[PDB]
């Protein structure tokens, strides 16, 4: 066995994009290909955008709801996606049921135990062969002992409660910043794994491509006279980073080739 | 009581039924055991299967909205080779286990008398259970068991699992949103299964092994009607929606191709 | 120190059964006799037969309700069981004794904490130098939060509750889901069990094992008399048995079926 | 301290007792430690004692019916050669050990005072007691103890124990099912005991040891009268069931043969 | 270092004692002195007698309440003891001291937890340069859920409630006897350990005197025509079994010299 | 996975800004990795920043008390040679997790229901986030987030944080003592901070660092009128009260150098 | 990696307070400068002093209410404390928010768990690249139930009820087996501190270290009607000051300086 490791790095300045890729290429006699462990790291910003405090009937913020990775390699070439992390969890919750009598009386209960994230990562439904992709979505949102909450909360009359303070000026009944999740309003920094065979007599350089995104909500938030109501839109704004890099697993040496930064906007 | 591990050759195949939407990633590794009366190897059966939950209106009656997701993943391997035998596979069923905390109590101020028992147990949103198993091979099937909602656990066999009162009228409105969908459902499976298996020496070099992925989707129905939810259900709406695909083994040349794969 | 490694498989495709045998010969220069670790693995099905839903007045169904294991030798061989896994257990459990007083009450009560499975492994009785056996029994089974009951509980009244629902419906769908039952009474056993055996150097060449899978079905039925629903156990209605026989050479480590018998035993 | 672990010689001897279905799995294991005085030896004793529990009507008023299941297990290794003493054994006596929490408050909102006091300690089904020994040999009794049932423990000494309403006419229906009886009663007995042993050089080079198991069986019985369900329970209603097996050793041809057992 | 190990044995089968001793006498070249370990194991029967049923106004019972072992070594030879095992226990315990207010009320509340062994084990007050020696002593014994209880217990009208269970006979008035610790009615099995220093110099052979010991305490109960009272009489039987052991610190063997077996009673 | 660890070439260098009481403890591990295709280098960050906290009586108004406390340390390194990247950096965000404890119960005596759920969660004093990275640098803000107190835990971003009832005529008097003040408040900051680093071969030998060390203060306002106590609060009050020191870096002669210190 | 160990001691039996200082000089190949690990301990009285039983309308005591340790290097020479422990700690601590209700009510709660020390150890802010310092100060401490106190525990009438226990004023204080261990036993410090060295440098340098004490004066008094207490800061402050010869060349330390500092306010 003999290994080999380098790196390499796009930015996204504008976009405040990241990608730090870490390479191992891994050289196995027992084996008849030649394997690589790609480590994807970097950062991407949630894009949050502070309200304005003056806004008076109706009021609006943006916020980073979900987070898009992907690596892929290309129809035509030798390298498949075999392996990858994290994957997909089978979740689990433990349980309790009490039975109890006096004498008259009867009481009986259940308590299930679990654990409970503010972003949840899941993998992309278009993962083949050729490319893994995970997703790291908005989940369980708590506002103060209020929720949990998520992207897609609806109350009957207050709508949207997310990131809705007390049902003042409109931009000034928001709850304070520092009370949002750490991925809604801060950096993203992912932490993906993914492991790619390369067939031999396949060609000396290929081409892989990975994609930084981010999907930002609009949340806003209206007064009707009597309450204030929110509500959430998703994916109003939309911020992607698409690098390919070349490889060339004759020398074990990166090259990034192409960039591309794309705005899309609602 | 141990058996059987020494020098490795590892082959790896992967493939994707696009029509399917589910990936195999299977590794094979030849083990040359050199204190072994046969040849042996172990498939480790990996990959994708996604959730292709959708969300529609009936083509005859768009005003009802249909849920559909899968409660069964379904997970095989065979071979018809009568020199190959299957002698070790992972998972397996096990026994259940659970904690029993029980206490009598008596109060006197008076005369007073109490009772309570506590069982405590772990759950698993879908259960892995060994289906079928023979030393041709083994069929497992990982099915939907038990969410975790507000107000309690909610059972995979309860009909008015995942529906909720509209909130827009869309399809999808009529269904609670991801954040209250496991990763199976929402996202799909990931499975992770081992086989050990043989091969008898001198009697043929060549065995062929079908392993099949796939879903049982079950489909929820709901719509509204006089102000009031009308919820319905229909368990194994469509059954074993697989793709198989069919690999040639050469325990001689260590050699491994793919035969098939249907569907495409 | 030396270890030779081989396996051998027996099916009963009718019967739904599968032999895994795991074999280790050991030759110890310390030792005057042949080691054989013998790990027993495989497949046993419950033989679960799903209720009419159209049955009315009286319904029944097939459970499984003890599997069976044996490895044995020969009356007229060396070879002798020394030693298996698992054996009996002496079980243990914990009490908490609490007294209390207030002033004026005065209260008191004691707790036990253990734990409680579905199917219990015991050894048979049968047990001997020349034969382990295990079973594997419905032990502690849960309805919802009603129970535990087993193969032989009897209410007064409303006889054995294990997989009586309720309702006022048919009777073949007054049971239990199917899911609600344990998954060794509705699906497959998947046995693992360990023996070693010692064999006489100056023994023969060859010896002969007879392993043995086995399965009790039980009949639970359950009937309407006009006020309630019962229900009835009937143990061990049905028996279906798997034999085989394997040809051991001590002196090239090999293993070799030699006999299947497959028997159908029905009341 | 650091006694005693270097090179081995192990011989086995395996046994059974048809006429009380009791196995005895014995195994020996010559010490040569060349940092010892003189020659030892390690016995591991292991085996099988059927409970032998049985349930039947009385001969003389076949309407009672009698339920016989074992107390004790009987566990010992003698042996009469001078120049061989015991030097290990295991298991030993031990000091019973409990956790103890206590607690004392005051309220005043009025005036008010409480205490409270809980005892936490484990227990065992049957407890392993060491009846006798000394540089010939060990005796051990386990005897039965507790048990769980619903409602809470109950002593192995309370008469009422393993009666039951009669669910049927036989003898069996009077007692409890299976499923309220532990393994020890329902299957059987696994006994694991071991004993190091000396040997003076020199003066002579063999031995006999006399090494025992069985039962000590109670015997419960139960009975229908005036709508009133009556139980007595007679205690060592059938003591020492044991049997007795003689193994000869050869300290010098590390030579192990079975000299007799009784019964057979 | 060199290690050499041997054993050596006394029984009295009269008192149902018995004295396994295991030995390692070690060589340490970076030490002036020989060392020698010695491991003090065997039996020591409780001397439990079971009482009579029969009889009606006053009953007793004996039992074991203490055991006492000492190992020795003689004023004229070089062996000092050195080392030794159990040592006396600066006992631990945990405390929880709540306090709580409600708004009128004021509670306050204290717990300790702690162990609690039936028979506990000090260091003899004769111990010194050339003599160890341990007391293991009844401790904390509990009826039912009654006690804890232990040899001087006095109830102002029961007396010691001990081992009173309850209108019956005197002798069937006591508990049941597995109802009783085990070290009381069955047998004490010593786990002693002590390290012994001898100088070069000094004698080729020297003498330890390893000293096994009960002390039974007589149980009795009586009927004054309104209850049933007991009482306790420590050490009213003591069973002492002395034995002298030869140590050949040139060879490393050990001989049985001296047995005595004294027999004292009130 | 694997990457990056082998061989070493280490220097230190150590500096204070005696203007603002900031001490950066720096120390540059030159990798030589045998398996790797460019230079790598291991910033490691250490040091002092004192929390400066401060007490006083405003000039143009000494009757109402200031106390100026560090909500925020600031700590970040860049650089501008195109030849190097930030490969490695500790800490990074994560996500946040939490424990769930829900419950629904019935009584009957009467119907009765109740439910009750419990989130468990772990709590620092300053939270550290990053607040911004890409390949050429990396900055951190350690923010004042949550404090132990009588009567429960309060937010940094309540604005009666530290305010209390004058024990005395004295600015101090006016706040909390020092044993209700955290470490990072009554003392300083003590960062530990990682940055790995790639530089390409044959492209320049030299390379310069920008390590940056701060606080934002924040000043919390208390004065006494007509017996009621008022406090107030200004956030940011002085932002970025920052050092900044340049290092070079000489990737072939592994030399480091200190180029310049803002402020003295 | 070679490592050469040594240790230097220094008494002040007027003050009872004494340094051990552990030395461990590693030279490196993989470093250009020489690294020194020095670890300093041993003891620093509390100073406490017994109250007076028969003092009857006002009584007082001293007792040991921080401690500060400091090791220096000299801004002539070429060597830089480069690292110590302890450092200054992050605290965490634990919360639950309960939220439950029932019909046929709405109670909430929350519950913080954390660690409570009756002194606690920070860094000195005139920490520098040639000096690092600690104090252990006196910060969480119980009367019986009662408290936690501090050295500026104030409440309106009873004033600073840290050592106040309910007679004779120096017979109304708490037992003195009641108070923490440091304010009326002795300190026994243990830090650690890492300095390097330019080899190009002094063969010789000097290191100066510091152990001090800082006793209050927690008084009480009756009015007539109560017993008030009050703590007074740094009344009493005893130093000592050892200043030690390193040789970076040998391997050697030995005590040149020695100062005993007597403040009293």
Redesign the interface.
């Known amino acids: 066995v003999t ?5 390499a ?3 996204s ?1 504008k976009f ?1 994009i ?1 990608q ?1 890729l ?1 390479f ?1 290429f891994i050289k ?1 006699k ?4 030649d394997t690589l ?1 790609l ?1 994807a ?3 991407i ?1 949630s894009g949050f955008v502070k309200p304005n405090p003056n806004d008076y009937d109706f009021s609006k913020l943006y916020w980073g709801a979900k987070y898009n990775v992907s690596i892929s390699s290309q129809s035509n070439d030798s390298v ?4 990858y992390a994290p ?39 278009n ?4 490319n893994v992709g995970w ?6 949102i ?1 506002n103060n ?1 209020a929720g949990p909450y ?5 109350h009957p009359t207050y709508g949207n409660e997310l990131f809705l303070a007390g049902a003042a000026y409109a931009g000034q009944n928001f709850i ?1 910043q ?1 009370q949002m ?3 809604s309003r ?4 992912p ?1 993906f ?1 993914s492991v790619l ?1 390369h067939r031999q007599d396949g060609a000396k350089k290929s081409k892989i491509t990975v994609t930084y995104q981010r999907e930002m909500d609009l949340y806003q938030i209206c007064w009707n006279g009597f309450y204030w109501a929110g509500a959430n839109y998703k994916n109003f704004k939309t911020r992607t980073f698409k690098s390919t890099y070349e490889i060339d697993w004759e020398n ?2 990166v090259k990034l080739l192409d960039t591309k930064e794309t705005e899309n906007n609602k | 009581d141990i058996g059987q591990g020494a020098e490795i050759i590892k082959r790896t195949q992967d493939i994707t039924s696009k029509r399917l939407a589910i990936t195999q990633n299977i590794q094979f590794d030849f083990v040359k055991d050199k204190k072994y009366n046969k040849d042996a190897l172990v498939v480790k059966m990996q990959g994708f299967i996604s959730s292709r939950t959708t969300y529609s209106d009936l083509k005859k009656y768009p005003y009802i909205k249909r849920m559909i997701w899968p409660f069964q993943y379904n997970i095989s391997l065979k071979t018809k080779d009568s020199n190959v035998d299957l002698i070790n596979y992972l998972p397996k069923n096990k026994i259940d286990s659970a904690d029993v905390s029980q206490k009598l109590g008596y109060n006197i101020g008076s005369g007073s008398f109490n009772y309570s028992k506590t069982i405590s147990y772990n759950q698993k949103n879908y259960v892995t259970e060994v289906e079928s198993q023979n030393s041709k091979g083994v069929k497992w099937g990982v099915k939907a068991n038990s969410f975790v909602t507000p107000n309690g656990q909610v059972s995979a066999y309860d009909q008015y699992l995942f529906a909720q009162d509209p909130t827009g009228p869309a399809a999808r409105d009529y269904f609670v949103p991801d954040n209250q969908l496991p990763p199976l459902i929402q996202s799909g499976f990931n499975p992770s299964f081992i086989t050990t298996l043989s091969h008898e020496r001198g009697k043929g070099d060549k065995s062929e092994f079908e392993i099949t992925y796939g879903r049982n989707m079950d489909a929820t129905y709901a719509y509204v009607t006089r102000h009031r939810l009308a919820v319905d259900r229909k368990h194994d709406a469509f059954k074993n929606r697989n793709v198989t695909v069919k690999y040639e083994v050469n325990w001689k040349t260590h050699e491994v191709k793919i035969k098939s794969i249907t569907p495409k």
Request: hydrophobic share 25%; charged share 25%; glycine share 6%.
């Open positions: 290994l080999y490791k380098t790196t790095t796009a930015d300045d405040k990241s730090i870490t191992n196995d027992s084996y008849d290909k462990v480590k790291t970097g950062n910003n498949n996606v075999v392996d994957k997909n969890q089978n979740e689990e919750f433990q349980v309790q049921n009490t039975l109890g009598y006096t004498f008259g009386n009867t009481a009986f209960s259940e308590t299930i135990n679990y654990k409970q994230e503010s972003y949840r990562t899941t993998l992309s439904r993962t083949n062969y050729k997703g790291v979505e908005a989940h369980k708590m002992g998520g992207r897609d909360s609806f304070a520092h999740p750490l991925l801060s950096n993203f920094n932490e794994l065979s074990h040496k």
